[PDB]
Amino acid sequence: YVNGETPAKIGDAKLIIGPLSSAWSPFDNKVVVYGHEVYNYDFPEYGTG
Amino acid sequence: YEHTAVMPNKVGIPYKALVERPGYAPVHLQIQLVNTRIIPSTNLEYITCKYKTKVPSPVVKCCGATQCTSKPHPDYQCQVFSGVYPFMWGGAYCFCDTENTQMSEAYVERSEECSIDHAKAYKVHTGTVQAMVNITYGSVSWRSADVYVNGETPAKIGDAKLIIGPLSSAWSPFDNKVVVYGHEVYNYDFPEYGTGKAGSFGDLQSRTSTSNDLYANTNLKLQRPQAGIVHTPFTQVPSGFERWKKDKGAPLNDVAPFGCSIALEPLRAENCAVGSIPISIDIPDAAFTRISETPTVSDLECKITECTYAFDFGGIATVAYKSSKAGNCPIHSPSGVAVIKENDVTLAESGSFTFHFSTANIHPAFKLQVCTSAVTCKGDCKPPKDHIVDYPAQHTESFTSAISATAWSWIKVLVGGTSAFIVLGLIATAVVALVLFFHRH
Amino acid sequence: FTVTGEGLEYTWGNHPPKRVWAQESGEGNPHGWPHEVVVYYYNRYPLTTIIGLCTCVAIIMVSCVTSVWLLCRTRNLCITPYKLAPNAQVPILLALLCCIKPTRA
């Protein structure tokens, strides 16, 4: 797990993986998943059409 | 007809408004809120409860030596003791003196009560706000259904269509991480499933109450059996979850501001009071009557009989009118000085009627409109005798609500006289300067 | 417990919580003598009427000394072209009305 608290035992040794230096994510706040691909689309928010 | 306005975020106080379609009589509109739930989105991280360290049966060799294997168990422990010479019922257990072996393995598993009381660790995120609104208009009775607090989704109640606007503030009483134990909610931080200091909160963390894998550190350590008795002793630090249930502070439903009562089943935060909620409603066209089929009043005279500061409905006034025909038309005070208890009046030919109002000002200077005709009202109010009441105020206190007519006179005296006493001082130096120029030539 | 106009909620034992709100009764009288208007606003606004009284006694004090700085500067300019020459005839309007020092000689 990529966080600076949880340790993992790989065989005998113990590895702590630090947090990532960038908070960048490719996703938007709203996504549309059709089939096997994702689209950074906006929503009518269930009230409009 | 579409009528947009801004309502405050108060639960018990209704919002009264008067729509005005041209060529038609005005229709009274009353919107009241019955609920206000802020529902954040949560994902469960892990649960925690009291442990139970079970011990298997140790092996006893009469004369020999074995070493155990490392087994995939949480906090598994092995320690081989040499030369015990154990005793049981019916004489000594083994014959080979001074060289014996006891295994005495132990490990930590979950308890039976973990399916009943366990603290659940949550991370919250911003979700949906939902509210319930009570709606009436004209001669139609009260109709109610729940709405969504966002400026897009409409709700159809009765024959109207209401779009509740998004909240003006994004305040939420929850922290980023919360702990839900039993009935109440706490604001707390987690050791993130990989750490635990064996005595505070995370000495036994499981991701799911029915999960197979379990993490536990409890400083489990076996001791040597004494005097030839077949038993396995151990010492360890006590439970952190048992320690947490004593040394925990006040929950979130006793600390949170704005009077937010906290429920549990979707983990909402009910009935907060912060900001304002914009409105947008669609009154049907069948609720509008023509303007020619209504009474037209004239010669309106308003006199305030009794007024008082009290929070609830403190004021009686009388209005003398003269109407052409008999009928019904609503009353409304559009200013923020006073709110009106009544909604409509029954009219006659040159009679009188009474209305009740509540205000926070010493001298009310409000006006009301009846039968699309306005009339001003003035008076004086007295402070109330009661000290503490058990209902919220119907009105809103302004900045100049407490300033009386005597206190206004002392403000004008202590500002106008001191301003003119510099102006006379400034104009005194503009007289001898003109005189000195005349004396030069 | 201090209860303000916003309210206060208290729980006692296994009883349900109860909410109480405070009104604006006070003790003083607003329509009366100057020793009663100050008392009434001292109970309703104890945090503001001790600043506004100190502000209004500071605006008045500053305005009092600035005006007499200009009034006495006007006063000695009435006299300085007339008391240097004793044979100059002082008009009777400037003796008492326009400036304080009366005529002589």
Side-chain angles (χ1 to χ4, degrees):
Chain A
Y1 282 77
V2 184
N3 52 339
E5 289 121 38
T6 303
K9 178 151 294 274
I10 310 166
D12 189 324
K14 219 179 55 57
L15 172 65
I16 287 182
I17 278 273
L20 268 155
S21 35
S22 75
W24 176 88
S25 203
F27 301 100
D28 246 6
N29 331 307
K30 300 147 123 182
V31 295
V32 166
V33 300
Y34 173 55
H36 63 265
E37 53 216 344
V38 60
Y39 301 88
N40 274 353
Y41 203 42
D42 288 30
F43 296 153
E45 215 88 36
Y46 200 73
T48 82
Chain B
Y1 189 57
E2 200 227 5
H3 162 62
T4 80
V6 171
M7 103 164 290
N9 199 3
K10 304 300 184 33
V11 177
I13 317 292
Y15 174 73
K16 311 194 200 227
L18 210 63
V19 302
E20 288 135 11
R21 206 186 168 180
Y24 296 84
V27 202
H28 204 245
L29 177 96
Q30 215 186 317
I31 321 190
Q32 205 190 36
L33 283 163
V34 168
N35 289 284
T36 279
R37 327 177 283 275
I38 292 177
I39 320 183
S41 99
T42 60
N43 46 334
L44 165 73
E45 297 230 354
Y46 61 96
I47 77 156
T48 169
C49 51
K50 198 204 196 143
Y51 52 84
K52 171 176 69 48
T53 84
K54 68 148 320 201
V55 284
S57 279
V59 305
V60 180
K61 283 176 299 296
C62 271
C63 38
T66 46
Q67 307 304 297
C68 91
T69 44
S70 198
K71 302 215 216 205
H73 284 329
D75 230 359
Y76 189 76
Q77 287 277 328
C78 270
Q79 173 93 72
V80 178
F81 308 103
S82 313
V84 279
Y85 190 36
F87 279 74
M88 290 223 58
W89 73 282
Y93 182 74
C94 269
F95 178 58
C96 321
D97 198 5
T98 204
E99 187 255 299
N100 275 254
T101 280
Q102 190 172 320
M103 188 53 71
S104 81
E105 63 209 302
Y107 71 105
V108 166
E109 64 158 354
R110 254 192 265 112
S111 43
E112 321 176 90
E113 300 116 14
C114 202
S115 55
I116 301 303
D117 45 343
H118 52 273
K120 312 212 279 314
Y122 283 109
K123 283 234 202 334
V124 313
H125 293 289
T126 84
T128 69
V129 188
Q130 310 178 200
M132 183 178 301
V133 298
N134 229 356
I135 272 283
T136 179
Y137 56 95
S139 93
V140 200
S141 46
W142 293 81
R143 299 280 264 98
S144 89
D146 89 6
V147 293
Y148 275 86
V149 184
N150 49 342
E152 326 270 2
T153 298
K156 304 203 61 83
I157 40 186
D159 214 329
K161 202 175 60 51
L162 210 174
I163 301 182
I164 272 283
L167 295 179
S168 41
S169 75
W171 180 88
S172 205
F174 302 102
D175 220 323
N176 184 37
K177 297 144 119 194
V178 291
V179 169
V180 184
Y181 171 61
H183 156 245
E184 60 255 9
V185 192
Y186 299 89
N187 275 1
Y188 201 57
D189 280 62
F190 313 139
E192 219 43 77
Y193 194 69
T195 51
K197 313 291 290 194
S200 47
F201 187 56
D203 64 327
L204 182 126
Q205 307 166 295
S206 156
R207 286 227 163 247
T208 290
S209 180
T210 60
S211 158
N212 294 327
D213 199 36
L214 176 100
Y215 161 72
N217 50 25
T218 48
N219 234 35
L220 179 52
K221 168 188 185 102
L222 305 134
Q223 316 295 104
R224 154 162 261 276
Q226 92 268 38
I229 289 130
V230 194
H231 75 297
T232 171
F234 50 90
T235 88
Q236 78 204 302
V237 281
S239 208
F241 183 65
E242 172 211 276
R243 201 263 279 259
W244 182 70
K245 292 191 302 203
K246 309 192 109 161
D247 306 78
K248 54 179 183 160
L252 208 55
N253 49 78
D254 301 330
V255 171
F258 301 112
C260 303
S261 47
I262 291 187
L264 209 73
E265 263 323 319
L267 198 87
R268 54 220 171 200
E270 280 189 301
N271 281 305
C272 299
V274 49
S276 78
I277 301 177
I279 87 168
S280 149
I281 208 186
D282 262 8
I283 292 122
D285 290 346
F288 290 93
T289 88
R290 264 299 176 173
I291 188 188
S292 64
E293 273 67 76
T294 42
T296 45
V297 300
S298 34
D299 324 286
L300 308 141
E301 191 67 80
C302 155
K303 172 177 61 80
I304 288 183
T305 301
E306 171 133 37
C307 180
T308 191
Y309 288 36
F311 277 148
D312 195 26
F313 291 132
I316 308 172
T318 47
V319 164
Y321 72 103
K322 273 173 106 79
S323 150
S324 73
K325 45 162 299 195
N328 285 43
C329 56
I331 60 177
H332 182 225
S333 161
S335 42
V337 178
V339 317
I340 317 291
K341 177 182 191 33
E342 276 87 11
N343 304 318
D344 57 82
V345 284
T346 77
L347 292 182
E349 287 79 355
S350 165
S352 164
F353 63 95
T354 52
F355 72 101
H356 298 249
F357 70 101
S358 162
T359 169
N361 309 80
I362 312 193
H363 316 289
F366 78 106
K367 50 164 283 296
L368 77 95
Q369 33 201 277
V370 60
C371 265
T372 174
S373 315
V375 47
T376 200
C377 292
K378 281 204 57 86
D380 290 341
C381 313
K382 284 186 263 263
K385 300 296 164 265
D386 225 354
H387 276 291
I388 277 177
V389 302
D390 38 1
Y391 37 80
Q394 304 260 7
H395 45 248
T396 81
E397 158 138 9
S398 188
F399 154 73
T400 43
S401 303
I403 290 165
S404 74
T406 296
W408 263 126
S409 287
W410 283 96
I411 283 169
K412 302 201 295 266
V413 157
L414 284 191
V415 152
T418 84
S419 173
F421 195 57
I422 311 189
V423 157
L424 185 103
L426 279 171
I427 212 180
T429 77
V431 163
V432 285
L434 191 96
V435 158
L436 271 181
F437 154 99
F438 263 50
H439 279 326
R440 289 260 320 253
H441 33 274
Chain C
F1 302 120
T2 293
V3 180
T4 166
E6 317 278 88
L8 168 136
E9 173 183 290
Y10 71 100
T11 85
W12 160 250
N14 294 310
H15 296 282
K18 311 227 311 195
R19 318 193 144 168
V20 279
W21 285 266
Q23 256 168 349
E24 228 65 59
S25 86
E27 309 183 15
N29 160 247
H31 304 117
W33 295 114
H35 68 91
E36 286 186 280
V37 194
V38 156
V39 160
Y40 172 68
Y41 289 120
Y42 187 50
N43 295 357
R44 207 218 184 94
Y45 303 115
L47 77 165
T48 322
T49 198
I50 213 180
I51 275 175
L53 259 49
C54 280
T55 288
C56 89
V57 86
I59 298 307
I60 280 174
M61 151 98 65
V62 154
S63 154
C64 176
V65 288
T66 305
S67 91
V68 304
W69 170 257
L70 296 196
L71 198 74
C72 267
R73 155 173 276 246
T74 315
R75 201 212 96 86
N76 58 345
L77 292 207
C78 296
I79 308 314
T80 191
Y82 276 73
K83 75 158 147 52
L84 267 188
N87 45 321
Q89 259 300 290
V90 195
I92 213 74
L93 264 84
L94 258 284
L96 191 101
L97 260 279
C98 280
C99 262
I100 312 296
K101 178 185 251 276
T103 173
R104 260 165 92 181

